Amino acid sequence: TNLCPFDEVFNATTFASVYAWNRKRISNCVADYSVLYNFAPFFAFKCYGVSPTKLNDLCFTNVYADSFVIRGNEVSQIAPGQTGNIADYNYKLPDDFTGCVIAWNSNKLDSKVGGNYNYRYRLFRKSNLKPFERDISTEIYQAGNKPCNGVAGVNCYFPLQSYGFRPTYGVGHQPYRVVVLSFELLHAPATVCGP
Amino acid sequence: STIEEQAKTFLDKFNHEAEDLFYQSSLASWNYNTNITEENVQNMNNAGDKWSAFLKEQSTLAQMYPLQEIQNLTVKLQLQALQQNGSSVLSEDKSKRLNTILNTMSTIYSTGKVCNPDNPQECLLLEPGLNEIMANSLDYNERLWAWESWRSEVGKQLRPLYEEYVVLKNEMARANHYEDYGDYWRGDYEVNGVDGYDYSRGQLIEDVEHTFEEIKPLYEHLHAYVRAKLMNAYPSYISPIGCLPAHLLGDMWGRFWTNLYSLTVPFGQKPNIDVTDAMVDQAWDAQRIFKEAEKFFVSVGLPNMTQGFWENSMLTDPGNVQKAVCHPTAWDLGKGDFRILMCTKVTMDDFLTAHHEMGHIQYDMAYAAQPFLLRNGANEGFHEAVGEIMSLSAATPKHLKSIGLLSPDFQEDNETEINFLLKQALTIVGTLPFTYMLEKWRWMVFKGEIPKDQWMKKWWEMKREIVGVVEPVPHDETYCDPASLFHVSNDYSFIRYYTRTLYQFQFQEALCQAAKHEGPLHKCDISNSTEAGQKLFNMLRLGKSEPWTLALENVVGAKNMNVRPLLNYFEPLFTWLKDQNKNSFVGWSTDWSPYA
Ligand SMILES: *[C@@H]1O[C@H](CO)[C@@H](O[C@@H]2O[C@H](CO)[C@@H](O)[C@H](O)[C@H]2NC(C)=O)[C@H](O)[C@H]1NC(C)=O
Ligand SMILES: *[C@@H]1O[C@H](CO)[C@@H](O)[C@H](O)[C@H]1NC(C)=O
Ligand SMILES: *[C@@H]1O[C@H](CO)[C@@H](O)[C@H](O)[C@H]1NC(C)=O
Ligand SMILES: *[C@@H]1O[C@H](CO)[C@@H](O)[C@H](O)[C@H]1NC(C)=O
Ligand SMILES: [Zn+2]
């Protein structure tokens, strides 16, 4: 009946760090996927399991608009069966992922000539991320064999690094505002519909 | 958790912090060089002091991961380059003396001035007061004045400093386990742990001398031919079997003979190819110059210039009030930001240099995937030679004809090719004995073979025997004539210029063979050859992650530096020189002197 708050996930003033990927569970509203274009310099719309062409034909039990920021090089990592710092330790997608990936260059917003250190990723983690997990833990990461005692230092590196998006950066290092649209499909009434 | 895995993680944190800080140091240096003001000066000092302090810190945390227990050569190469101590190994007092002497010498040279003898009010800096006399004047005593005064005013002051410079630089090397400072400098070419591609530091001296042996006959003919023409323009002064006086060589020292083209041109009636005038008629600007350069690299299969490159680079002098350092430089700031700072005029020289500096950018873009510590040329001599081969192809009559700067009605005869080759040989071949002898003298000074009271005596002995160049005025051991050159009194290794020369002709000969060029090597244009660009690229993308010997083999098919392509390029001039020197003496004598 009411419009799904895609304006929220796709036009929010601030998105998220990828390590704390923010999900807006979508339900009982009307989905109008054609609106999804903000006239951005580098737009990607890969979809898996579902068909992006005429995406406003399929009901789902839920839609999970996971939003974050990463640099351009790592955008490809937001995809099934990928590897690298993002998908390994920050935000993994499953093998048979059934949804969509929508990213766009945001150097206009999230860069600063002094450097925007607000957006973080997770440089080290002890075990690879099970699909759609989130590790918001600041556990001082023990790389060596002596316990780290919750204080950083030798082989005790802090597990989160900043990006420092400056505007003079390159396309593969500029901030890119990713929006995953995980389409859940359970036995439930599947209230997420709409042409 | 082994120690190789701790080093693997230590380098991972480093690679992300180092990329961030080096980006601030590069962007602070870029803002200074593009806008020079006293406020920009201050920030280049701050970011450059934070980056110098972060590197200094990280080295100590790295010495805890022993290189022996690390087996992945990529990790070893990063730690080895990070574990460098340098000045640090010296006491906090000696590490402060050395930094003072290096600062004082660099200021004595750059600010070094000599004033007219007749007019003690009129003084001249080396650039552009004395360098201007050396290049363009054709008097004898006016050249002898500037050549002597520079070495007697600037050089004599540097002499006590260079003696202490040698002593401390050795103690730095002997505490990083090198034999001497020269051995420390030769560590740039060293390779260990890769069987079949290893390269010892001592091997460089064998290579450099053995290769220079093959250069000798060409140089002896270029020297004899140059001497004969010089003997006809300075009749009473130059002997037909003696060395060339050091001040008649085109510049302050004789590093390049390029300025002697006016007096040595074989067929001075036939003009030189100067597309400068054609660029003005077609309304070319700097935008077009780099676009035509960007076109050249696309044609061989290399990627176009980054969108940031056009937005942030400085392709013209901003002029007016915003001043800048106009020395052409390519900037790899990192994080995808590439930039060229060139005060371009619409001339042919800048057209070719834009190709040369953009070659540096293409090299930098290529290995941009590599880890931070491995983003560099395979050795020192790679990076310059990758840019030089760009200006080799771009300046050919073929490329000029294919871009519409040279009309297809212009015809190349065997005489303009001889004019072309000789102007190259004055620049290229002429610097090889100068470069090899200078780095030989410094190498022998550091090893201790030349005592202090024989410094200037062994210098001018070796200048006669190797370079075939004689001083016009005798010098005692209060001079330091090497120190009168920038690269000597400013602590820069010099053999890179010899190795770079031989590298570039190895590349160009290999790239043209892949491009199926037919004819002499000096006529070749690698344009449109994607096979050539591919061959070059698979070395460009390696960076420092491979031994330079493997990098050299991925282009030219040989593991070692060779001189034959250099000879092959210059052969048409060589057999012609063997003709013009038919009834002239080939060789020189080391005991003649214009000072009796
Ligand atoms: C740089 O200096 C460090 C510190 O001096 C060197 O590492 C030390 O070497 C001494 C040699 O007597 C050992 O006793 C120490 O255990 C070492 N470690 C530390 C933390 O001091 C390091 O070898 C030097 N690097 C190079 C390349 O010379
Ligand atoms: C999203 O925000 C931009 C900038 O504020 C605005 O131009 C655009 O109209 C917005 N789009 C929607 C659908 O609200
Ligand atoms: C060394 O490390 C790199 C990067 O992790 C890896 O690709 C390479 O395979 C390693 N070396 C060997 C011999 O496997
Ligand atoms: C660059 O130099 C000019 C001098 O004309 C100065 O006015 C300007 O402020 C400088 N740039 C910046 C970003 O301040
Ligand atoms: Zn260069």
Residue numbers in the entry:
A (entry chain B): 333 to 527
B (entry chain A): 19 to 614
Publication excerpt:
BQ.1 (KD = 19.07 ± 4.08 nM), BQ.1.1 (KD = 14.70 ± 0.37 nM) and BF.7 (KD = 13.37 ± 0.29 nM) S proteins to hACE2 are comparable to that of BA.4/5 (KD = 14.37 ± 0.41 nM).
As previously reported, the binding interface of SARS-CoV-2 RBD in complex with ACE2 was divided into two patches.
